[PDB]
Design a protein around this ligand. Structure first.
Ligand SMILES: NC(=O)C1=CN([C@@H]2O[C@H](COP(=O)(O)OP(=O)(O)OC[C@H]3O[C@@H](n4cnc5c(N)ncnc54)[C@H](OP(=O)(O)O)[C@@H]3O)[C@@H](O)[C@H]2O)C=CC1
Ligand code: SF4
Ligand code: SF4
Ligand code: SF4
Ligand code: FES
Ligand SMILES: [Zn+2]
Lengths: 47, 77, 74, 123, 123, 77, 692, 80, 117, 61, 68, 57, 112
């Protein structure tokens, strides 16, 4: 009100941000999975 | 994009239903766009006729989802 | 960061006996603890006074005379 | 975007320190000529030499920087700030970001020693 | 080591007043999974006055500290140290603690006790 | 918690009525996206404004806004 | 000595005779399981870790199938995936629909492994339906809701093996098996709040943190536990101004995954009777006050009393930070008075053993070293109460090996088996000469534990004379590669206080103080402080010690501050601050640093790093966090602690008493909590706790 | 008043101080009965003596010298 | 009636608004914050305001105690919480209560007490 | 629901999950393409003497 | 618009065919308390005020002195 | 539209404090504290919605 | 049926195409990755401008339209940001990705 302009101030919240990423899974949720590589473009096994 | 990452296949009815609501969304988009352009140039009547047809379509969104303008209907699954 | 410029300290006690722990850093979303009544706060001096007073979070009590001026204090 | 903005410069990275010194020299000249334009343009309360000493002080901040690459990013940011200030795209509320302490004394009880910082536990 | 704290746009007070911590997350005692215990987290130690305080109005947890929610994940310990002193931060590093390998047999459960039994298993 | 997505990266583009709209999402393997990015169709259209709108009059700088369909939820976000 | 095999194509080498699940854990292969645990016995109940093994007709349980050479293990067989879906569906058909009301929502082992390995849908839809299990009131600390039990025996295996409380068991056949005491008998042990982190489903859960919060909301913070001898590792979960629970993170040396009862459930008293503002006594009434009011009242009362020297007593207490003791010791010694004592009875003098030579007052064998022991004896202590995790160590090593115990002091009810020797220093010296000179001289790795309760005895130096003569005379108990004289210290501050030199001189014990400073220091009696003296109590919550004060000053407790703590072993460890001090409390060294400025003392530090530099000036083993060093001075220290009380103290015939009266209420936080208050009455000798 | 000192336990130029400890603690206790010593050990610290006098005034000295008599001369100079 | 507003000043509210609800006088949680503490904490903004048009919605701990206790002949008492006029799945998930101990065991979703007879 | 998925007894879920059967990014260096140009392919292997073929692979590796 | 009753509000907006006079007693919800109907009191002094439903998170010490 | 906490037949609060509405809310409008009440039943002490940051999903 | 099964023939065609593209500019292409009908060329920053011109100018490629270009930071890498370019040949109905790297201060050259 004093300066009759907007002022830019350091941050302060009326409710703090609560992330809920703390509390994700502790089991590895997906496997390795298969491959789409064709038989032409992977290295040959010897013999 | 998430379906492509997740490697899942959506059912058949779920495909035809997002084809259809992807096209009344297209009708609503071109309706808003053409009529807002015609107002920006100066025609006043297509603005209101088109927004009437938009109200007739927002009734369908209100049936399908809950809210009219913002619908979380199409999900990654 | 912001700071309570008006206060000498954190914990202030009134003369009446009430104990006032100021919370947090300075600024808008913090609270100093004081309750203040500014009469005539729509006036010329009072607008600057309750600008400076509610800047740090002292609870300002505004007795108003007309409903249309006081909007500029909210 | 065929043609560029008026006071633009294609960003270009110099491998020698003396060319960067010449460019920051030219850039201080460009800020310093444009300070009456800034004082007229943003309708500020104070005098032109305070803008000029702000410009000097903001170059006094980054004098003993060694790394040429960091001097290069610092030059490019400074020329972008000049291009925003001279074209009047920044407004007076963001122009006066640069002057936070001049506009008003924030209040009594500035904590300097350990005791005045302790009584308000740093506020 | 290059110093990138002046070109990230972070304030000076974050680099000079705040100490940070690199840590590997402990294996939880509740559940037996170990998946969140590989990436090195970066997290800031709290400020005494600025952390959290109860709102007068409702009881909302209001904060003045803004880095309290940010937390980083790194692949290796060296990458976290390199990034942390590259951004100019004071860090403490906490070494992880693994379990000691002890050989288990099921046939341990019922070995012949020549003297006093001094235990009753139950299964 | 949510479901978890296999680790990967995709750019999936469909045709909005505004034009081609896509999304580039980088999946950590966690249940939060490591990175998302929309490609707004109107972003490239408003970015192509001064290539087209040179030499036109001032009324014709407005009927060209209506064709590139700037809704501005797209362009900045 | 090792065996090389193949899991998932991976080739792995592991010590011979181990379980197959340890080979899968070594190779990085994730195997799901419900009744296996690192610190517990092997059982094959839950049938979850089935695995495809070449040269085996059926899928064998990976937790109890021993490692053999030439072994080819596959875990991604279609048969193994089918087996895990099968066993998972079998687990879920009598397990009740309690996930919105269960306390293990984001923490349930059954639940996260049902996504990853179990079936999508459920075929359980009978009209008759699931079974129902009667609720079983165990005790006040453990809420018990046994419909959602899966019978993994893990609680039973633990309370049998390590806790030494055989009251748990399994009574029945078929679905009508239950897991509880058969008679509805109350379960005591000194660590009964550890079975509720152990159960993988939420059948045994926390009673004061019954339904308060929820793990995706909680912010975890890795700190150190005060109100324990060993200084165990914890994990503080905070909503952000409140503190919810502490829960043990693993360290194989200090606690080995298992944590005290009193350490765990004292989060209740962290937030119930706290000091949030300074209070000045008017006379029969406190008033609360301004900071400048309280600290200038301290300065004015110093200028009024004027203690010129040896009259400013500054006694610390049970839980304090090392850095606050740096602050206090620096303030008193720049004041000009080393009347700088500790809280315990007979704390006014040097504690009958050297501040010199750190191996005098520390647990000199490692805490990891008690596993290697052959025949050990304790004097004047009850390790079941004090350092209850050390009791788990002693019983565990006694169970695995051939260990021999006797005890000198009160007749203790151990979990393990002691022999009795007596209640007298004469009974001590007779037992050292008669039987156990031969036993401790015969044994390879013996040790001797000394309680700090007999350090607080006035006849202390007779005991230290006899034991120092025995340790110096016997070359087996003290040699190069390990050290065998050991002591326990009750409080977390006493080892740090003896590192820093926080002890009075012989001159300082003679005078009566005019101004007393209580930093913590709750167990002071009314008679210990003079009636004319101007006492001031700096501490985090109200107590006995706050009631005697003329000024109280709120401080940050161990959650609210980052602090160095030194245990009985000698580890320096830092606590991370979880939350901030509520109301107007400040950190403990900053208050003393500011009270110095109103006196004539400018303390040379003023920031948190300069405290660390001053702390390295006191001893650089306190900036060297969580390392243990040996002692080359083990031979010299026993002699130098022998010479002092030789003939100076005569051994009186007073019997050796118990050190603590109750377990549960012994410091400022535990006496404030209602959880310990209704715990100590319910864990008093009743018919529900008598074994009968 | 009190005197305190610090050595590294490893044999890295702290052996002469260490031998001075093992031979002369008992003599220094009799030389100064009111003074309390404290000896500490951490494997990285250079050998150093802090002596603290009245009213919180202390003085230090570094002990990179390889003779017990020289170490006693340093300690005797720093008591003064 | 007269409660002290941190200054020795008595503030006076009617007795029908100090109750937690018109079912129940007292508090049903250890942190329920009784109404006198609420009007003590922020009376600055109950100024010039009607207390009657505040909600005050019928505390539920008393409306469940007056419901009768169901009696089950068998061992296990099974519970929905559902209506059976409603076309769909309403109510809570089905849980099965053991009624063996003396007394009446409550549903943890609905609070309806079941007793074996 | 559809029939091979609402089926009470014939399907197991691991046969019909495809979230866990995702394929991987085929990341190819420059040196593995030299391997594919000189060793060969699994469709057409140009490798004889497999015990020496591993050593022939190893220098490219 | 806030002065119309809840079951009737859904009918005036064409949600239900049958008015709440003509619905059966099966679709009448069972209650154990009386009904009040406050419409809306914005600007009126009977406007809603919000407050803390629970007490402050960390308690302070009520002081008692001691004669030593 | 606006929000409502329903009740059971014969008057019981229905909110068993499972925090699932809080964990899913995309704009973090919900805040709940929960305590075990006198009956031993799990109920919310404090339930709260900010309608200025609710997005009606 | 697995929705990844419908891609497999085109994913093999995409492999052979990318092996050709690497054999054509060996000085400038460090790697490639084919996920599932998604091709990504892996290129140095001083190699941005010579590859892009090729993707515009060769008749077999003709990646005329720029689609979207952006960055992703991995703070664990020494070169923190990676910069991705998406192209679309509207002739051949094909998409392509081009990934390079850049630290906070060192550049990547512009294709504008
Ligand atoms: N040159 C100056 O300005 C000087 C002023 N002062 C004094 O400072 C004070 C405020 O100065 P200033 O800001 O300039 O003038 P103001 O406009 O503030 O004076 C009027 C203020 O008081 C209120 N007011 C006037 N009469 C009544 C009444 N019967 N009941 C309730 N409120 C009333 C007004 O209400 P509303 O807002 O609705 O109009 C207004 O807020 C005054 O006391 C003045 O005497 C001191 C010396 C010189
Ligand atoms: S323990 Fe069982 S009932 Fe509780 S949340 Fe986990 S799966 Fe559900
Ligand atoms: S009581 Fe708990 S730990 Fe024991 S067997 Fe049952 S579920 Fe497992
Ligand atoms: S807390 Fe929320 S999600 Fe849980 S039962 Fe109550 S209203 Fe529903
Ligand atoms: S854990 Fe191996 S079967 Fe239970
Ligand atoms: Zn029910």
């Amino acid at each position: 009100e004093e300066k009759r302009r907007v002022v830019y101030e350091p941050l302060e919240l009326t409710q703090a941000f609560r992330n809920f990423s703390a509390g994700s899974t502790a089991w590895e949720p997906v496997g390795p999975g298969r491959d789409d590589r064709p038989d032409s473009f992977k290295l040959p096994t010897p013999k | 994009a998430v379906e492509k990452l997740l490697n899942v296949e959506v059912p058949l009815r779920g495909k035809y239903i997002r084809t259809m609501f992807g096209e009344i969304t297209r009708v609503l988009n071109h309706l808003m766009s053409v009529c807002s352009h015609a107002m920006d140039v100066g025609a006043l009547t297509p603005f209101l006729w088109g927004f009437e047809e938009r109200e007739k379509l927002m009734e369908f969104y209100e049936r399908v989802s809950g809210a009219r303008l913002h619908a979380a209907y199409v999900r990654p699954g | 960061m912001n700071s309570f410029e008006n206060l000498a300290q954190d914990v202030n006690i009134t003369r009446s006996g009430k104990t006032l722990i100021a919370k947090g850093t300075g600024g808008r979303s913090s609270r100093t603890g004081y309750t203040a009544t500014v009469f005539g706060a729509n006036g010329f001096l009072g607008s600057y006074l309750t600008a400076k007073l509610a800047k740090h979070g002292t609870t300002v009590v505004v007795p108003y005379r007309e409903e249309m001026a006081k909007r500029h204090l909210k | 975007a065929i043609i560029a903005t008026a006071f633009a410069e294609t960003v270009k990275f110099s491998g020698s320190k003396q060319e960067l010194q010449k460019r920051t020299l030219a850039l201080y000249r460009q800020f310093l000529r444009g300070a009456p334009t800034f004082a007229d343009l943003y309708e500020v309360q104070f005098s032109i030499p305070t803008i000029r000493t702000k410009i000097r002080q903001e170059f006094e901040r980054h004098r003993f920087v060694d790394d040429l690459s960091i001097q290069n990013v610092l030059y490019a940011k400074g020329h972008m700030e000049y291009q925003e200030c001279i074209n009047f795209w920044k407004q007076q509320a963001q122009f006066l970001k640069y002057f936070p302490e001049e506009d008003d004394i924030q209040g009594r009880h500035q904590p300097s020693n350990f005791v005045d910082k302790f009584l308000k536990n740093r506020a | 080591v290059p110093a990138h704290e002046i070109v990230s746009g972070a304030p000076a007070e974050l680099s000079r007043n705040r100490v940070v911590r690199i840590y590997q997350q402990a294996k939880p005692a509740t559940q037996s999974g170990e998946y969140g215990t590989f990436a090195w987290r970066l997290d800031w130690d709290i400020v005494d006055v600025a952390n959290r305080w109860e709102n007068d109005l409702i009881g909302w947890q209001s904060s003045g500290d803004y880095m309290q929610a940010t937390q980083m994940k790194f692949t290796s310990k060296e990458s976290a140290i390199k990034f942390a002193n590259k951004q100019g931060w004071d860090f403490y590093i906490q070494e992880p603690h693994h379990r000691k390998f002890r050989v288990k047999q099921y046939a341990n459960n019922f070995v012949h006790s020549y003297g006093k039994l001094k235990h009753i298993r139950t299964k | 918690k949510g479901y978890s997505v296999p680790p990967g990266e995709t750019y999936t583009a469909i045709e909005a009525p505004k034009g081609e709209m896509g999304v580039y999402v980088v999946s950590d393997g966690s249940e939060r996206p490591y990175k998302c990015k929309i490609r707004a169709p109107g972003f490239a259209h408003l970015g192509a404004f001064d290539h087209i709108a040179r030499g036109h009059f001032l009324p014709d700088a407005v009927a060209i806004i209506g064709t590139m369909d700037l809704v501005f939820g797209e362009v900045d976000r | 000595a090792e065996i090389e095999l193949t899991i998932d194509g991976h080739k792995v080498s592991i010590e011979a005779g181990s379980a197959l699940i340890q080979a899968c854990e070594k190779a990085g292969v994730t195997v799901p399981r419900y009744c296996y645990h690192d610190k517990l016995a092997i059982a094959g109940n839950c049938r979850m870790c089935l695995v495809d093994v070449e040269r085996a007709p059926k899928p064998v349980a990976s937790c109890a199938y021993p490692v053999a050479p030439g072994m080819v293990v596959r875990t991604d067989t279609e048969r193994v995936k089918q087996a895990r879906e099968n066993v998972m569906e079998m687990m879920l058909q009598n397990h009740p629909l309690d996930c919105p009301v269960c306390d293990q929502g984001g923490e349930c082992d059954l639940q996260d492994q049902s996504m990853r390995y179990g079936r999508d849908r459920g075929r359980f839809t009978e009209i008759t339906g699931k079974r129902s299990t009667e609720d079983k009131n165990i005790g006040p600390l453990v809420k018990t809701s046994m419909n959602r039990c899966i019978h993994c025996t893990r609680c039973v295996r633990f309370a049998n093996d390590i806790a030494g409380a055989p009251e748990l068991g399994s009574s029945g056949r078929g679905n009508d098996m239950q897991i509880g005491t058969y008679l509805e008998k109350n379960l005591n042990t000194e660590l009964s709040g550890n079975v509720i982190d152990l159960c993988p489903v939420g059948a045994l859960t926390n009673k004061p943190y019954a339904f308060r919060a929820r793990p995706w909301e909680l912010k975890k913070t890795e700190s150190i536990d005060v109100m324990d001898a060993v200084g165990s590792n914890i994990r503080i979960d905070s909503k952000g101004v409140e503190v919810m629970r502490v829960i043990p993170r693993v360290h194989e040396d200090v606690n080995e995954e298992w944590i005290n009862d009193k350490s765990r459930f004292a989060c209740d008293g962290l937030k119930t009777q706290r000091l949030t503002t300074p209070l000045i006594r008017v006379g029969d009434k406190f008033v609360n006050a301004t900071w400048d009011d309280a600290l200038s009242t301290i300065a004015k009362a110093y200028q009024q009393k004027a203690p010129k020297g040896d009259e400013f007593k500054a006694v610390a207490g049970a839980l304090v930070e090392v850095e606050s003791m740096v602050a206090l010791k620096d303030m008193t010694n720049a004041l000009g008075s080393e009347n700088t004592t500790t809280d315990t009875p007979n704390g006014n003098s040097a504690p009958a053993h050297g501040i010199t030579f750190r191996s005098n007052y520390l647990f000199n064998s490692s805490i990891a070293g008690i596993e290697d022991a052959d025949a050990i004896l304790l004097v004047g202590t009850n390790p079941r109460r004090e350092a209850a995790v050390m009791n788990a160590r002693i019983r565990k090593a006694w169970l695995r090996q051939e260990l021999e115990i006797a005890s000198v002091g009160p007749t203790l009810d151990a979990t393990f088996d002691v022999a009795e020797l007596g209640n007298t220093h004469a009974d001590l010296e007779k037992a050292l000469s008669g039987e156990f000179g031969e036993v401790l001289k015969n044994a390879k790795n013996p040790l001797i534990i000394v309680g700090s309760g007999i350090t607080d005895r006035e006849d202390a130096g007779a005991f230290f004379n006899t034991i120092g003569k025995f340790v110096e005379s016997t070359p087996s108990v003290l040699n190069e590669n390990w050290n065998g004289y050991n002591v326990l210290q009750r409080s977390a501050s006493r080892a740090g206080a003896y590192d820093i030199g926080f002890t009075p001189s012989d001159e300082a014990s003679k005078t009566t103080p005019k101004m007393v400073w209580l930093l913590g220091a709750d167990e002071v009696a009314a008679s210990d402080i003079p009636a004319d003296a101007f006492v001031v109590y700096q501490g985090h919550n109200g107590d006995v010690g706050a009631q005697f004060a003329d000024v109280v000053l709120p401080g940050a407790a161990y959650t609210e501050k980052a602090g160095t703590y030194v245990n009985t072993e000698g580890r320096s460890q830092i606590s991370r601050a979880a939350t901030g001090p509520p109301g107007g409390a400040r950190e403990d060294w900053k208050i003393l640093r500011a009270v110095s400025e109103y006196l004539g003392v400018a303390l040379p530090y003023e920031d948190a790093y300069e405290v660390r530099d001053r702390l390295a000036e006191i001893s650089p083993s306190l900036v060297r966090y969580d390392l243990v060093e040996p002692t080359v001075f083990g031979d010299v220290a026993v002699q130098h602690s022998l010479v002092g009380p030789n003939g100076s103290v005569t051994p009186s015939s007073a019997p050796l008493t118990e050190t603590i009266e109750n377990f549960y209420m012994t410091d400022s936080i535990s006496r404030s909590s209602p959880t310990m208050a209704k715990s100590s009455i319910a864990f008093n000798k009743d018919n529900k706790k008598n074994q009968a | 008043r009190e005197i305190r000192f610090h050595l590294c336990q490893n044999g890295s130029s702290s052996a002469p101080l260490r031998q001075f400890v093992k031979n002369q603690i008992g003599a220094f206790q009799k030389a100064n009965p009111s003074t309390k010593v404290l000896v500490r050990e951490a494997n990285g610290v250079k050998p150093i003596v802090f002596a603290r006098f009245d009213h919180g005034h202390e003085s230090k000295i570094g002990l990179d010298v390889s003779s017990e008599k020289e170490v006693a001369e340093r300690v005797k100079s720093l008591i003064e | 009636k007269s409660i002290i507003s941190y200054n020795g000043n008595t503030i006076e509210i009617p007795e029908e608004y100090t109750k937690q609800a018109p079912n129940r006088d007292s508090t049903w949680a250890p942190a329920q914050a009784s109404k006198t503490e609420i009007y003590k904490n922020n009376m600055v903004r109950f100024e010039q305001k009607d207390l009657s048009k505040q909600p005050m919605p019928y505390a539920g701990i008393e409306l469940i105690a007056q419901q009768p206790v169901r009696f089950v002949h068998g061992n296990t008492a099974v519970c929905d919480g559902a209506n059976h006029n409603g076309p769909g799945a309403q109510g809570h998930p089905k849980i099965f209560i053991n009624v063996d101990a003396p007394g009446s065991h409550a549903c943890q979703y609905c609070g309806t007490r079941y007793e074996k007879e | 629901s559809s029939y091979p998925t609402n089926d009470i007894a014939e399907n197991p879920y691991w046969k019909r999950d495809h979230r866990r059967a995702y394929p991987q990014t085929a990341f190819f260096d420059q040196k593995t393409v030299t391997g594919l140009l000189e060793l060969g392919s699994e469709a057409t292997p140009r490798i004889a003497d497999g015990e020496a073929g591993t050593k022939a692979l190893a220098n490219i590796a | 618009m806030s002065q119309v009753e809840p079951g009737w509000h859904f009918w005036l907006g064409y949600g239900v065919d049958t008015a709440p006079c003509n619905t059966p007693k099966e679709k009448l919800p069972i209650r154990a308390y009386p009904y009040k109907f406050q419409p809306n009191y914005t600007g009126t002094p009977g406007a809603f005020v919000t407050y803390n439903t629970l007490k402050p998170k960390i308690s302070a010490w009520e002081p008692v002195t001691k004669q030593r | 539209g606006e929000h409502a906490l329903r009740r059971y037949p014969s008057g019981e609060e229905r909110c068993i404090a499972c925090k699932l509405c809080e964990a899913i809310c995309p704009a973090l409008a919900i805040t709940i504290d929960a305590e075990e009440r006198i009956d031993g039943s799990r109920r919310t002490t404090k339930y709260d919605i900010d309608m200025t940051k609710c997005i009606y999903c | 049926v697995n929705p990844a099964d419908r891609y497999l023939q085109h994913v093999s065609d995409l492999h052979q195409y990318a092996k050709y593209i690497m054999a054509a500019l060996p000085k400038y292409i460090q790697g490639f990755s084919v996920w599932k009908d998604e091709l990504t060329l892996h290129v140095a920053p001083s190699a941005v401008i010579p590859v892009t011109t090729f993707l515009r100018d060769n008749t077999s490629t003709q990646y005329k339209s720029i689609i979207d270009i952006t960055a992703v930071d991995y703070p664990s890498r020494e070169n923190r940001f990676e910069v991705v370019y998406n192209f679309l040949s509207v002739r051949h109905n094909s998409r392509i990705r081009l990934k390079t790297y850049a630290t906070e201060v060192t550049p990547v050259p512009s294709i504008t």
